[PDB]
Amino acid sequence: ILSMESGKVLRAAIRLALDVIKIDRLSRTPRDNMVLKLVLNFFRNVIAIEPGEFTINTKKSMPKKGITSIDTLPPNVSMDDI
Amino acid sequence: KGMRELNPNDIDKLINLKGLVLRSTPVIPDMKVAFFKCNVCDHTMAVEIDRGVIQEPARCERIDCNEPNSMSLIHNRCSFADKQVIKLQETPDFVPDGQTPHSISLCVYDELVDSCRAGDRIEVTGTFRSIPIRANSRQRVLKSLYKTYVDVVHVKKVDLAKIREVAAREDLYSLLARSIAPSIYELEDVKKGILLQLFGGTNKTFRYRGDINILLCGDPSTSKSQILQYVHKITPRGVYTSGKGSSAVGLTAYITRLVLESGALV
DNA sequence: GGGGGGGGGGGGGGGGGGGGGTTTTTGGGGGGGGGG
DNA sequence: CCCCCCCCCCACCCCCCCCCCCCCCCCCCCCCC
Ligand SMILES: [Zn+2]
- Ordered DSSP codes for B130-192: EE--BS-TTS--B-SS-EEEEEEEEEEE--HHHHHHHHT-SSHHHHHHHHT-TTSPP-HHHHH
Is the Cβ–Cβ distance between B36 and B71 less than 8 Å?
A: yes
Residue B63 CB neighbours (<10 A): 7
Say if the Cβ atoms of B40 and A70 lie within 8 Å.
yes
Q: Is B162 (CB) below 7 Å from strand C?
A: no
Say if the Cβ atoms of B39 and A69 lie within 8 Å.
yes
Q: Does B226 touch chain A if contact means CB atoms closer than 8 Å?
A: no
Residue A53 CB neighbours (<10 A): 8
Amino acid identity of residue B228, one-letter, is L
Amino acid identity of residue A43, one-letter, is F
Please tell me the distance from the alpha carbon of residue B228 to that of residue B206, in angstroms, as a whole number.
Answer: 34
Please tell me the distance from the alpha carbon of residue A23 to that of residue A47, in angstroms, as a whole number.
Answer: 28
CB contact residues (below 8 A), chain A span 1-60, against chain B: none
Is the Cβ–Cβ distance between B116 and B155 less than 8 Å?
A: yes
Q: How many angstroms separate the alpha carbon of residue B81 from the centre of ligand 1?
A: 28
Number of A/B CB contacts below 8 angstroms equals 22
Please tell me the distance from the alpha carbon of residue B76 to that of residue B240, in angstroms, as a whole number.
Answer: 49
DSSP 8-state secondary structure symbol assigned to residue A55: -
Pairing mode, strands B71-73 and B44-48: unpaired
Please tell me the distance from the alpha carbon of residue B17 to that of residue A33, in angstroms, as a whole number.
Answer: 96
Nucleotide with C1' nearest the B136 CA:
C21
Strands, E, within chain B: which ranges? 14-24, 28-38, 44-48, 71-73, 79-90, 103-109, 121-131, 147-157, 254-256, 259-261
Q: Is B138 (CB) below 7 Å from strand C?
A: yes
Is the Cβ–Cβ distance between A54 and A67 less than 8 Å?
A: yes
CB contact residues (below 8 A), chain A span 59-78, against chain B: 62-70
Please tell me the distance from the alpha carbon of residue B95 to that of residue B100, in angstroms, as a whole number.
Answer: 8
Distances (CA, A) of B129 to B23, B73, B101, B113, B190: 20, 30, 21, 18, 58
Name the burial class of residue B52, with classes exposed (0-12), middle (13-18) and buried (19+) by CB atoms within 10 angstroms of its CB: exposed
Please tell me the distance from the alpha carbon of residue B192 to that of residue B227, in angstroms, as a whole number.
Answer: 12
User: What phi, psi does B161 have (nearest 5°)?
Assistant: -60, -50
Residue B132 CB neighbours (<10 A): 12
CA dihedral B166, B172, B177, B178 (to 10 degrees): -80
Please tell me the distance from the alpha carbon of residue B206 to that of residue B210, in angstroms, as a whole number.
Answer: 15
> Between A63, A64, A66, which is nearest B39 by CB?
A66
| No. of helices (H) and no. of strands (E), chain A | 2, 0
Please tell me the distance from the alpha carbon of residue B178 to that of residue B189, in angstroms, as a whole number.
Answer: 10
Distance from CA of residue B70 to its chain's centroid?
A: 45
Partners of residue B37 in chain A, C-beta under 8 Å:
none
Q: Count of residues for chain B?
A: 266
Distances (CA, A) of A22 to A11, A30, B197: 16, 15, 105
Residues forming a β-bridge with B23: B87
Is the Cβ–Cβ distance between B4 and B103 less than 8 Å?
A: no
Distances (CA, A) of A52 to A55, A59, A72, B47: 9, 21, 7, 33
Is the Cβ–Cβ distance between B162 and B47 less than 8 Å?
A: no
Q: How many angstroms separate the alpha carbon of residue A82 from the centre of ligand 1?
A: 24
Say if the Cβ atoms of B40 and A65 lie within 8 Å.
no
3-state secondary structure of B84: strand
Is the Cβ–Cβ distance between B230 and B181 less than 8 Å?
A: yes
What is the separation, in whole angstroms, between the first and last Cα of chain B? 39
B220 labeled binding residue: yes
For chain B, the residues before each gap (C–N > 2.5 Å) are 158, 206, 257
